[PDB]
Amino acid sequence: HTVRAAGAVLWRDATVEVAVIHRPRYDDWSLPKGKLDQGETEPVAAAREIHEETGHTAVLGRRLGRVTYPIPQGTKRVWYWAAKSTGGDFSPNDEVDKLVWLPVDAAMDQLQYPDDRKVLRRFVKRPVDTKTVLVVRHGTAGRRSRYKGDDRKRPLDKRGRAQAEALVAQLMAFGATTLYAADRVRCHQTIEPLAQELDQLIHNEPLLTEEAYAADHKAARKRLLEIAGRPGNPVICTQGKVIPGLIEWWCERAKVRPETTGNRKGSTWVLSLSDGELVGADYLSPPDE
Ligand SMILES: [Mg+2]
Ligand SMILES: [Mg+2]
Ligand SMILES: [Mg+2]
């Protein structure tokens, strides 16, 4: 059995300070992390565990790596994110009796686990006050047909509609604010549950279908950057053949290493930007994988 968990470096502005917590169970000082509840994805687990353990609300940004260790049940895998506090206040709780805010150097000395210190070294290495473009592959939508036109009207199937529902919370954990979808029904349907949650329109993007991408790949790159440049954190739902071409191109020009890679239906690429430069590309599994 692998137990899945998520954690964060919770930070706020002064130049940045980060939260270290004390737990009486081990008398230790560590970074907030906890286990995924039923039906949760790692990003939601992180944000919930942060608010439970520290009393702060926060929006996740860049991913900061993974920690794996044995436990009596088997293995625990923990993924960490940088998380900006959006407010709140600590008070002693069941799991955590104290919390200190520390500049990074001091936090480095406070943290007793080498693995947390590694995570914190990832954190300081790149900017953390980032905006976030969220590139999503549309959910499962059955079989491809014989008819020309790339099944423009083909809808999500039952699993795909569920992936769409599951994505709402996951994408909300990155402070998603505006919505974009390639001119295919399945792409829109994948983010319509989020649109409902945010009560917002989805902007249609004919330049980001597979057809348009192959016919004019430069138009798509140029449009991806326009969207990214707009204020807010855009969600862009597109197709399998478009995603690798765009992400790989952007990672190579920015010199960004993706720690994981994939391209499954319902998966998300979290693209973190600082001053309009890509500083991160984080591949997340479909919510039901
Ligand atoms: Mg906890
Ligand atoms: Mg915990
Ligand atoms: Mg917990």
UniProtKB/Swiss-Prot annotation:
Keyword Disulfide bond recorded: no
EC id: 3.6.1.69, 3.6.1.58, 3.6.1.61
Cofactor remark: Can also use Mn(2+), with lower efficiency.
Gene Ontology biological process terms in this record: DNA repair; DNA replication
Name the UniProt record assigns to this protein: 8-oxo-(d)GTP phosphatase
Summary of the knockout phenotype: 12-fold spontaneous mutation frequency increase by rifampicin resistance screening.
Domain notes: Contains an N-terminal Nudix hydrolase domain, followed by a linker region and a C-terminal histidine phosphatase domain. The C-terminal domain is necessary for efficient catalysis by the Nudix hydrolase domain.
Residue positions binding Mg(2+) 2: 49, 53, 95
Superkingdom, taxonomy of origin: Bacteria
Motif Nudix box, chain ranges: 34-55
Residues covered by the Nudix hydrolase domain: 1-124
Pfam families for the chain: His_Phos_1, NUDIX
Species per Swiss-Prot/TrEMBL record: Mycolicibacterium smegmatis (strain ATCC 700084 / mc(2)155) (Mycobacterium smegmatis)
Residues bound to substrate: 23-26, 28, 33-35, 69, 76, 95, 113
Gene designation: mutT1
Sorted UniProt keywords: DNA damage, DNA repair, DNA replication, Hydrolase, Magnesium, Metal-binding
GO molecular function, one term: 8-oxo-7,8-dihydroguanosine triphosphate pyrophosphatase activity
Protein family per UniProt: Belongs to the Nudix hydrolase family.
Cofactors: Mg(2+)
